[PDB]
Amino acid sequence: PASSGLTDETAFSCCSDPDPSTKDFLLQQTMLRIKDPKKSLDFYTRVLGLTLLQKLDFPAMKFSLYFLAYEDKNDIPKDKSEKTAWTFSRKATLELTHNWGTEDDETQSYHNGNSDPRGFGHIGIAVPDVYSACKRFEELGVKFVKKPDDGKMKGLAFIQDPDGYWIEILNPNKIATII
Amino acid sequence: SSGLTDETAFSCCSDPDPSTKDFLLQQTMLRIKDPKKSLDFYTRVLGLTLLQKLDFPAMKFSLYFLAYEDKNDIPKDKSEKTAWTFSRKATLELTHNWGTEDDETQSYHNGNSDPRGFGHIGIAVPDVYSACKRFEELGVKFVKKPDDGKMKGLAFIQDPDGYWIEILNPNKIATII
Ligand SMILES: FC(F)(F)Oc1ccc(NC(=S)N2CCc3c([nH]c4ccccc34)C2)cc1
Ligand SMILES: [Zn+2]
Ligand SMILES: [Zn+2]
């Protein structure tokens, strides 16, 4: 017969315990290409409150990388080598990739993964209060894909960044409510 | 061209608003064709733990949450488990739309060919060369071997959907830059 999703039993049976060699692995980054770092940096820092950990430039290859994360800026090492080893050992960073010149091209944009052809869906941020977070987002001119009370899943939002990537806004202590 | 100067970049950065103080970067969502290949890949090859599984029969999809977390840390009772899962940093939400697994004319787009957007997720590891040795041994497909290309000591592998996963050592990137 055709799909009905895996039962917990089938799902749970596909799960292995971590091999000891993987014990110090961490999920360090999600990389997204960005058209204009001026817009993106302003959005991710001012709207969402993330910090720029490091900027890396690769002139020969004509791109820059910007690493953003929820980290205290006073924790960032000043020295470029110690900064680099710190940035790349932090959990949950965003690597924003700037291919030089895209900001000047008015016919160029990246694809957000949510229309054909689909793949990547979104990043997601946990906040203590979705409704107050989104009220602030609204006051700052943030574009919404889904307002918190819109649609089936009440109490949950999606906003877009300056490239159009979707960002889920959720409250971990109330997700239990909205099945 | 020539990129942003540090002064231009840094000048676009605001200090965080206090209302954002408890925000955390909780998930990256990827759509997956076959949850069987994927759970196997991410748990066994990569060593992540399945925190939780969610089903939405009305909409015909399931969500699988994976993260590097000790399973003995997972709340046993089903309600508080969810609030734990959704408060962990750096989880992967894998989205399975029912039926894609049986379809041979379907695959998802990895973001690295036209039209580009998403690039990859990235895993920091203590030793890239032994990790990739183990990966080779389990039959993992590579996009870039660690010694392949200019940037030595850094690898890209593919998951069962074709998404790229960077494999890196934070203490050797400083050398690599
Ligand atoms: F043109 C843009 F817009 F920049 O779009 C892109 C999109 C993706 C990339 N990155 C690619 S294509 N790869 C990563 C590293 C790598 C590839 N083959 C290899 C063979 C040997 C060693 C390393 C590699 C493939 C570079 C530029
Ligand atoms: Zn990367
Ligand atoms: Zn999500």
Resolution at which this structure was determined, Å: 2.0
Determination approach: X-ray
Query: Letter for the amino acid at B28?
Result: T
Nearest ligand for residue A95 CA: 2
Cβ of B26 within 8 Å of Cβ of A126? The answer is yes
What are φ and ψ of residue B120, in 5° steps? -170, 170
- Torsion of the alpha carbons at A123, A124, A125 and A129, rounded to the nearest 10: 150
B73 lines ligand 1 (CB under 6 A): no
Task: Residue B173: give the domain boundaries.
Answer: 1-177
Give yes or no for a cis peptide into A37 (omega within 30° of 0).
no
Query: Known catalytic residue: A9?
Result: no
The span from the CA of A100 to the CA of A164, in Å, is: 19
Structural domain count, chain A: 1
Query: Residue B44, SS3?
Result: helix
Query: Residue B35, SS3?
Result: helix
The conformation of residue B72, written as its DSSP 8-state character, comes to G
What are φ and ψ of residue B85, in 5° steps? -45, -45
Q: Which of A4, A9, A10, A15 to mutate to test the interface with B (most CBs of B within 10 A)?
A: A15
Between the alpha carbon of residue A165 and those of residues A44, A79, A139, B29, the distances in Å are 12, 32, 20, 12
Cβ of B67 within 8 Å of Cβ of A27? The answer is yes
Say how many C-beta atoms besides its own lie within 10 A of residue A116's C-beta.
7
Q: What is the 3-state secondary structure (H, E, C) of chain A?
A: CCCCCCCHHHHHHCCCCCCHHHCCCEEEEEEEECCCHHHHHHHHHHHCCCEEEEEEEEHHHCEEEEEEECCCHHHCCCCHHHHHHHHCCCCCEEEEEEECCHHHCCCCCCCCCCCCCCEEEEEEEECCCHHHHHHHHHHCCCCEEECCCCCCCCCCEEEECCCCCEEEEECCCCCCCCC
Q: Residue B177 in contact with residue A60, Cβ under 8 Å?
A: no
Say how many C-beta atoms besides its own lie within 10 A of residue A76's C-beta.
17
Tokens of B59: 């909409």
Contacts of A172 (CB under 8 A, 6+ apart): A126, B26, B82, B83, B84, B85, B86, B87
